[PDB]
């Protein structure tokens with residue numbers, strides 16, 4: 001059966017305006033839905049280089065997003081069953097300021113530490129909410145956070161999100177990767193969990209405090225530590241060895257020690273010792289409130 005109402009967004013009234021994002025397997029476009037043919041601007045996600053397995057994953061992704069209703073999660077609006085109801089596209093609210101990764105670079109001169117901590121708090125709260133559904137995001141990064149306005153960000157994409165098995169606290173991926181955001185046990189055992197999302201959240205917090213400055217990204221810093229000339233699997237082997245023996249991204253320029261300490265606590269090789277998203281949201285909000 002049709003998991004969504006197929007009459008809500010009819011393809012003949014969904015008009016393309018602009019490309020917003022693009023990867024190897026998906027893209028997001030700005031469109032306008034004008035049923036009166038005379039409408040609302042929306043964001044539309046579609047597959048690229050689609051396959052039956054990717055379409056099945058996309059259906060799971062759509063079901064994930066439709067199940068989430070939270071101030072710091074982008075709003076699902078519906079599905080368009082295009083190509084004569086032989087294809088799927090996901091309809092979402094359009095967030096006018098784009099990805100946080102780009103916004104931070106464009107507006108770094110107006111964004112101070114307390115503003116970065118507001119962004120940190122909101123991402124944390126979206127992640128607390130995901131955990132209540134037993135969803136593991138698996139792709140937390142500033143490129144996947146969107147800006148609604150100067151005071152509100154939202155987690156914007158769920159293309160890699162998985163639901164935990166009923167009887168397990170981790171999801172084991174078979175055939176796989178943003179390796180420079182991955183927790184060590186994801187690299188060495190293919191295991192993803194709430195705690196590996198907390199590791200990746202530490203990387204997001206690092207990204208925020210770098211302001212996405214050139215040469216400070218996690219890939220650039222890890223490659224500088226590993227050796228820039230290395231290629232292929234040797235990179236992974238060195239990253240594993242580096243993380244297991246306490247190699248870490250550096251404290252960003254200007255970053256307070258207290259905030260670097262939060263990053264370092266998220267980057268614990270002991271999975272059970274990492275803080276929870278609830279711990280993190282309270283700690284960050286108390287820092288903001290005490291400033």
Ligand SMILES: CCS(=O)(=O)N1CC(CC#N)(n2cc(-c3nc(Nc4cc(F)c(C5=CCN(C)CC5)c(F)c4)nc4[nH]ccc34)cn2)C1
Pocket residue numbers: 020021022023024025026027028043045074092093094095096097098099102143144145146155156157
């Ligand atoms: C890699 C596979 S993917 O392509 O599928 N993937 C990439 C992906 C990453 C995430 N999350 N994404 C999602 C969106 C997206 N953007 C928007 N608004 C938007 C507004 C803007 F003003 C701009 C600008 C364009 C020109 N600039 C110079 C300035 C800012 C913009 F870029 C986006 N609203 C949305 N609602 C739901 C999704 C969504 C965008 N990228 C999901």
